[PDB]
């Protein structure tokens, strides 16, 4: 049954591929230190 073995093995290898694809830890370490310098004071007239 080499044809069914080939099809089941490749379907399982693709299933393992899409299991690993969603195996990640989303690290929300987006620091907001840029806003400490984004604000600019109003320029005067000289």
């Amino acid at each position: 049954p080499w044809i069914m073995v080939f099809l089941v093995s490749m379907a399982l290898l693709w299933a393992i591929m899409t299991m690993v694809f969603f195996l990640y830890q989303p690290r929300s370490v987006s620091s907001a230190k840029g806003f400490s310098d984004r604000t600019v004071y109003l320029n005067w007239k000289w």
């Binding site: 620091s31 806003f35 400490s36 984004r38 604000t39 004071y41 005067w44 007239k45």
Partner: protein, 53 residues
């Protein structure tokens, strides 16, 4: 970061208020310069009168 951004906006508003102070000091300085030039021309007139005497 959000609290620091709020305080920086407050500092910007205070900078705008001190800009108003700058413009008032500008017009005061212009009046000071004009009055000082009036004093010099008064001094020049008095010095010339003393020289004639």
């Amino acid at each position: 970061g959000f609290e620091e951004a709020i305080t920086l906006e407050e500092r910007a508003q205070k900078s705008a208020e001190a800009q108003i102070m700058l413009f008032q000091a500008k017009r005061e300085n212009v009046q000071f310069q004009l009055e000082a030039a009036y004093r010099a021309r008064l001094h020049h007139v008095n010095n010339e009168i003393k020289k004639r005497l």
